[PDB]
Design a protein around this ligand. Structure first.
Ligand SMILES: CCCCCCCCCCCCCCCC(=O)O
Length: 158
C-alpha cells in the first residue's frame, strides 16, 4: 500500500488495514442480502450526542460518544435490512487511528479494546465471506500469515 479509496470485494484471509484521518464513516460494506456494515471514527472527548452519518447513501442518526480524553474511538455498526436500525459493536480506543478488518472462516475479525493493548475478536452472527468494502480512506493489505504485523500497526502505528 497505500491503496487509494475504492470499492472492492476483498479476499478471505486478508487483513485490510485502514488509515483514516477524519471522524465519520471510514469504511462500509455489504453482501446485499442480510448485512450492511460500517466502522465509524469519533474524535477524542465527545460526550453523548446524536450524530448524522451518510451510510450507504442514507442520512442516519446514531447516538454516539467517546469518553476518552486522549484517544480516538472506532465503533462498528450493523443493520440487517435496507431499512433496518443500526446497532453498535466492538469499540476500539486508538492512538494510531488505524483499524483492521478480515473476512475468514465466515467470520469478520477486528481489533478491540484500547491501544497499545488492543486484541483481535470477531463477529459470527452470519457468514460474512462475501461482504464487499467501500473504503473512504487509504488502506493496506496484510495476509493472515503476517497478522502479527497487523496487530503491531494497530497498537503502535506504521
Ligand atoms: C472486509 C469487510 C469490510 C466490511 C466493512 C465494515 C468493517 C467493520 C465490520 C463491522 C461488523 C459489524 C458487526 C456485526 C455484528 C453482527 O451482526 O454479528
Amino acid at each position: 500500500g497505500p491503496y487509494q479509496p475504492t470499492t472492492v470485494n476483498p479476499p478471505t484471509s486478508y487483513w485490510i488495514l485502514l488509515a483514516p484521518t477524519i471522524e465519520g464513516v471510514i469504511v462500509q460494506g455489504t453482501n446485499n442480502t442480510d448485512r450492511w456494515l460500517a466502522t465509524i471514527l469519533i474524535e477524542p472527548n465527545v460526550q453523548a450526542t446524536d450524530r448524522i452519518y451518510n451510510l450507504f447513501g442514507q442520512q442516519v442518526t446514531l447516538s454516539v460518544e467517546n469518553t476518552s480524553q486522549t484517544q480516538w474511538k472506532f465503533i462498528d455498526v450493523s443493520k440487517t435490512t435496507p431499512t433496518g436500525n443500526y446497532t453498535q459493536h466492538g469499540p476500539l480506543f486508538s492512538t494510531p487511528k488505524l483499524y483492521a478488518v478480515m473476512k475468514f472462516s465466515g467470520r469478520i475479525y477486528t481489533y478491540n479494546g484500547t491501544t497499545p493493548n488492543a486484541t483481535t475478536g470477531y463477529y459470527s452472527t452470519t457468514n460474512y465471506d462475501t461482504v464487499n468494502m467501500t473504503s473512504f480512506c487509504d488502506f493496506y493489505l496484510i495476509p493472515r500469515n503476517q497478522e502479527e504485523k497487523c496487530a503491531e500497526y494497530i497498537n503502535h502505528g506504521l
